[PDB]
């Protein structure tokens, strides 16, 4: 019934065999609440370093992958070798993907298709730019992110929706918990309107930008908020106060 | 004296252990011409991999990279990374890059000055669309993407340049022996009066674009196609014969 706390460990393009190894050691070895699902999102190029060594009981989490499961497109991974390694999930429309690396919605959505039907797991994202809030169309811009999720997912039980405002990723500007329990509830209301009570209900969305140990305690309390997706942080030990945020 | 005939492997988005472990045994196994200098590009994932069981004597190339070590560029792999896992080289400016996923030259420009600062070999591609082709602008555009990459080069000693025209990429549609050499010859002079003779001179130009067992002895024989990016047949075993188009 009640949804599992989730938290996903981004590393985006951060570190070496060396210290990644020294990551997942300590990772490996820490009190870890076990309520909580952890997922750690690696380098492409070290994934498969990153499934060996981790835990099984910790997921692994690809940083993207493409809409095929092969074809002409270098520098694109793709779920089945994701798979291959035996990862499980994929972080898919992340800020960086939108914003940095112009990725469509229209594309993140064939992923999502493509990924769940792989039989991953996805982490979809979705966040509005301060200018966009500013504007007042919070609301209108994750909406439309979510449904060009929502339109190519038939089996809500894999996905994990994750709320990151750009404003917030990297900056030491994190949502209020207010700020971030505003979004959710109506992220959790368009699912319940749109898709169903069901999927409302069981869905995690977790919040992104910015979480750190000192201000998790307070985000996971929220009736709204599941978990965290984590960036900075993810490379630090204080990783483990956050799978540890609720206890 | 004379240039090192040159052949890179791109296998693109393809393959999984099972399967790379087959093409990379042949590989391994096979007569392969002394003369030549072979690279391979893996996917990401599988990198690691790749280094580990390719023979020394076969370099290994990442698809793509980004411009700096380290950072929150979700999806992205840095130099550092590549060299960490033991492979020497990077594919950049990829027309699949540059058409599908909107790489400027800017950008591979920067990836470039970087790949190369941190140690990396590069294989620096360009070509043309087939509507730049008609419009008769092939000269302008080629000379403008090479110059973004040579703007960002203090040492082409590493560097190859790589003419794959898009319209023969997957298309089975090559350039005749007459079409890359005339463009690899034009290619040549911008090096002379835009770098040096010297550079002109000892700098690789391979030609990409549907090369195949059938047709690379042809183009191979050209004044100044000094090799091959090679897609398609890459992944399959006349890759040798293409490695051998000289003897």
Chains 1, 2 share one sequence.
């Not at 949502?175 to 992220?187: F, G, W």
Request: net charge neutral; hydrophobic share 40%; with cysteine.
């Amino acid at each position: 019934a009640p949804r599992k706390f989730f938290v996903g460990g981004n590393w985006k393009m951060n570190g070496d065999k060396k210290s990644l190894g020294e990551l997942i050691h300590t990772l490996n070895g820490a009190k870890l609440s076990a309520d909580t699902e952890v997922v750690c999102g690696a380098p492409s190029i070290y994934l498969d370093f990153a499934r060996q060594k981790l835990d099984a009981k910790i997921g692994v989490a690809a940083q993207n992958c493409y809409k095929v499961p092969k074809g002409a497109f270098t520098g694109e991974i793709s779920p089945a070798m994701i798979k291959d390694i035996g990862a499980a999930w994929v972080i898919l429309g992340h800020s960086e993907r939108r914003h940095v690396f112009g990725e469509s919605d229209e594309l993140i959505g064939q992923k999502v298709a493509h990924a769940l039907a792989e039989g991953l797991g996805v982490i979809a994202c979705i966040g509005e730019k301060l200018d966009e809030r500013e504007a007042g169309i919070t609301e209108k811009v994750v909406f439309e992110q979510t449904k060009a999720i929502a339109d190519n997912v038939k089996d809500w039980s894999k996905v994990v929706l994750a709320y990151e405002p750009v404003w917030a990723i990297g900056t030491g500007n994190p949502n209020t918990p207010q700020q971030a329990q505003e979004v959710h509830e109506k992220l959790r209301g368009w699912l319940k309107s749109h898709v169903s009570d069901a999927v409302a209900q069981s869905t995690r969305i977790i919040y992104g930008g910015s979480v750190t140990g000192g201000n998790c305690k307070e985000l996971a309390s929220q009736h709204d908020v599941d978990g965290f997706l984590v960036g900075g942080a993810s490379l630090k030990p204080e990783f483990v106060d956050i799978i540890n945020a609720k206890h």
